[PDB]
Amino acid sequence: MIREERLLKVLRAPHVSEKASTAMEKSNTIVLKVAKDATKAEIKAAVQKLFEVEVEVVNTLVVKGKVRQMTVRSGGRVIRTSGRRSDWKKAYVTLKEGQNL
Amino acid sequence: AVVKCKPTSPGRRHVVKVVNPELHKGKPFAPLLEKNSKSGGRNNNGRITTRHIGGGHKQAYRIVDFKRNKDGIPAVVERLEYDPNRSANIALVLYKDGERRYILAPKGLKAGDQIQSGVDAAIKPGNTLPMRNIPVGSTVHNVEMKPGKGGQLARSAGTYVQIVARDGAYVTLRLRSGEMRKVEADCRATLGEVGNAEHMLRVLGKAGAARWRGVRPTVRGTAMNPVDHPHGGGEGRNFGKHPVTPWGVQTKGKKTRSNKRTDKFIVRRRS
Amino acid sequence: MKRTFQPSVLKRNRSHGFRARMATKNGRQVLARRRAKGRARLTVSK
RNA sequence: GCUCGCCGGAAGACCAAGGGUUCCUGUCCAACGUUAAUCGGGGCAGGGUGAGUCGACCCCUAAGGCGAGGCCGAAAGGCGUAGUCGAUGGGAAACAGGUUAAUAUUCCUGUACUUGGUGUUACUGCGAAGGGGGGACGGAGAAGGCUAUGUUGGCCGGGCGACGGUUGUCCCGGUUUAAGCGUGUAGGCUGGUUUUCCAGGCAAAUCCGGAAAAUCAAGGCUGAGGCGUGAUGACGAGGCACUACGGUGCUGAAGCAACAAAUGCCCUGCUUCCAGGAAAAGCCUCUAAGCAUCAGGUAACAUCAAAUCGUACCCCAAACCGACACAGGUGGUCAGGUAGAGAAUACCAAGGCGCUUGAGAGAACUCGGGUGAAGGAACUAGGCAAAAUGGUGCCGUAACUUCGGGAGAAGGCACGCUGAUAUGUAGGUGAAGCGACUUGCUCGUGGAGCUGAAAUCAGUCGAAGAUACCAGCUGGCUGCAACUGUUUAUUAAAAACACAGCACUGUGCAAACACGAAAGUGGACGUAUACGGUGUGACGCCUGCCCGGUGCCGGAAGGUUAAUU
RNA sequence: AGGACCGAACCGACUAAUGUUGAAAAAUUAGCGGAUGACUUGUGGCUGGGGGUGAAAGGCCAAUCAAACCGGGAGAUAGCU
């Protein structure tokens, strides 16, 4: 019994990335971005309830954000600024025999 | 006995070993061991307080019964064995209610001998009695200074004290240093002298033999610089001063005992 | 040859980290000085 | 792409630490790259890290840290008890194949395993911050049994030679297969089973310890490897549809034996020595308070859960530490062939590289090397440097000596290849056969097959047979220091320091002494055969005289003499 | 058996040459010493400046040592340049 709101917050976006398309069409696993604090049980329950599919297992990894740098014209001067992208969590969800999207 | 090593190499030329064939070769009795971690001469401030200490072979502490309070229970010596912590050998004994203990091994003790503690014990070596029950003139070891505290005098390899007189509630002992001490007669002592008397005869033979006993090298003060030690420098070998400690106190003769609390017990200072 | 900086994260944190600074009043004074200067990185705890 | 060269106990491969996207792909060449650059560890964009079993977290503890109360201390604070943290150590379980441009013990295929929760059934004494076992431990040495692994043969597939020959005892390649489950043998340790009793394990125990008696030693723990299964599976040289021929895709033979083997495993063993070789938990067991046809425990089955974080990449280096894409530094793991004692050395394999300025010329001079007539230390402060010696076996070897040494003293001789002894010997291994048995992971016998020195005789080639690489110069007389060792990181490695030994001296334990305004700690869980200080410095023969001076030790009659009154 | 012997890894640093605005703020090359021990090494820990540690050289204590480094007294003082 994970509450509804938790589930409605965990699933952020499907991750299209070639390795994801191949995974979908070969191993019947979808690949999707999840809240960085989501656990495997949360992702399982959320996918099952919100996509009405039956899932086998969830694998998760944490992607560390890259550094990109670019300029900002604040103050008239184009100052070169650098910063870190945000870390995110990637979930490999193995469906049993269904299909959603 | 003492055996001289054949000079097959320098460092073996001068080593004299003392080998005891009856020492138990095997693991010590586990329930009476505990770890005894080394200190390197450092105190809780982390400073060297005693110099020339460090390294050596790892050793475990054997809990030796220095009190001998099992009164009226005969015990049989199970076996003699080596103790890294002492110059003397220890004996594992079996009180026949089923309890094992470690005691210091007197001179003649061997496996199978019977020992006993108390006021009614017989006068034979290994037995512990209050000093008022022990005949005057007898040699004892492992002597208590305060009743019920445990033995503190004559615990080294071949030491003993002589009960030279009994004055009411006190006895007078000739300590091994030659000092006449007065100790109350209710303290306990074990008859006979301590066992491993051939201990002095060993010759270490080489520097490493001392290093693996836990002794670091001693630099002579006169080899130092004036900032390091009162025996300062001077090119060449120069001394020209009265020998002193590293901290300036004159050694080679100056007395250092200062204890008025206990000096009423010292009927004669050592020679 | 061998140089004086031989990095190790554990020793770095145990010697100069935030909690090591906060343990004693002298380290807390260091932290107060660094806050007063406006230092962006207060300790090595990055 | 074809040649050539270099590494190969590494300049190959996998990690820890550290770094932090450097990884892969597509683009760009300003700056960075010691040159050009289409290339890049550079810019820009996108992608990439998948775990019940690997690691962390976690349970447990070492040195040590912090430390309720506490004890100390002008204040700050110091120490420390209960405790709580702290790995570099101890506690639980996954293997082999396949796959991406980039991840794999993580994905997929096949086959497993561990712990915990909850149920059902069956049988039941359960229950600790307490007791006892166990965990649990050194150095060195020596086998023996094996395996990883290699070599050869057999088998299978292919081949018949750009130049004489090559249908053979010819050439090339392959002959791989795991965890788990079952069996329990080479070895190792230990007598077992009952009954009774009790001054021990703070209590109590049906456990441990101890004492008796009886009866069988014929039992039990441990344990590599082999064998079976896993596996009619996977992999497989190579062929063939397909095809951007990148490469995708489909088939797929043999898949055995002998011998030689580790520094790996049996082995935390065994033997031996002295310098006498962590802790706590997990685990097994015993009960106390407590519970009572409950709860709990054991077993089988079923079911569920095993979260979180790391996982890319470099890692002897161009990603780490040295300001550099720096001739430096950096812990662990792996350890193929031919010679060789070998992890040396030489040439190679797998694999990886040619070191991010090159092209000519062929002066002096400098650097690194090769060779030199005749001489041979005449050089020079000095044989500095170079040259030289260099292996194995045997013979032989002086003074001196502490009897061990000196000593590889010095100095000699024999070393290649071929054939016989012997179509391959001594030795090692050891099949089949036949026998036993307490009957297969059995014994005895047997010798097939395999491997295989060393020697001797005879012959033979060259100037030379330890042919390369590799690899002691030797002897004589002396100073110093006994010796091995240590030191001026970065001009001094010594005769200096240390040292075993010796002496003096202090110290009776709340020891002297040291660190601390203290508490306390070290000395030491030691106790005069001990500990501290000082000098000398193995060993041998010895260490003479002086106490006036200065110190130290002892004494106290007298002189002088502080606070105080 | 051995602070035994010869000799690689490993740990050193005796000689020479090169280098000396270096490949390098101490190295390279050829030799050299120890190599089962008073050995060597990884990860942690402890000792703090008149202090530590030191097989002792005034050695080492972050390329700094007859008294570290940072901040402060501080614009010390300078009959000298």
Numbering used by the authors:
A (entry chain t): 1 to 101
B (entry chain c): 2 to 272
C (entry chain 6): 1 to 46
The authors write:
Co-translational folding is a fundamental process for the efficient biosynthesis of nascent polypeptides that emerge through the ribosome exit tunnel. To understand how this process is modulated by the shape and surface of the narrow tunnel, we have rationally engineered three exit tunnel protein loops (uL22, uL23 and uL24) of the 70S ribosome by CRISPR/Cas9 gene editing, and studied the co-translational folding of an immunoglobulin-like filamin domain (FLN5). In E.coli’s 70S ribosomal particle, the tunnel’s unique geometry is shaped by the 23S ribosomal RNA (rRNA) and the ribosomal proteins uL4, uL22, uL23, uL24 and uL29. Of these proteins, uL4, uL22, uL23 and uL24 all have extended loops (ranging from 10 to 25 residues in length) that protrude into the tunnel, and along with uL29, have surface-exposed globular regions that crown the perimeter of the exit tunnel.
To further probe the shape of the ribosomal exit tunnel, single (23+L, 24+L) and double (23+L24+L) insertion mutants of uL23 and uL24 with loop extensions were also designed, with eight and nine residues inserted into the uL23 (23+L) and uL24 (24+L), respectively. These designs were drawn from two representative sequences of bacteria with exceptionally long loops (Candidatus marinimicrobia bacterium for uL23 and Actinobacteria bacterium for uL24). In particular, the inserted loop sequence of 23+L, which comprises of positively charged residues, enabled us to explore the role of the electrostatic interactions formed between the uL23 loop and nearby rRNA segments by cryo-EM. Unlike the uL23 loop in the WT ribosome that primarily interacts with 23S rRNA H6, the extended uL23 loop interacts also with neighbouring H7 helix: the guanidino groups of R73 and R77 in the extended uL23 loop form contacts with the phosphate group of A90 (H7) and the ribose of C455, respectively, while both uL23’s T81 side chain and the G83 backbone are in close proximity to A64 of H6. The extended loop structure and its interactions with H6/H7 were identical in the empty 23+L ribosome. On the 23+L ribosome, however, this interaction face is occluded by the extended uL23 loop, which is highly positively charged and interacts with both H6/H7 rRNA helices, thereby reducing NC-rRNA interactions and eliciting early folding.
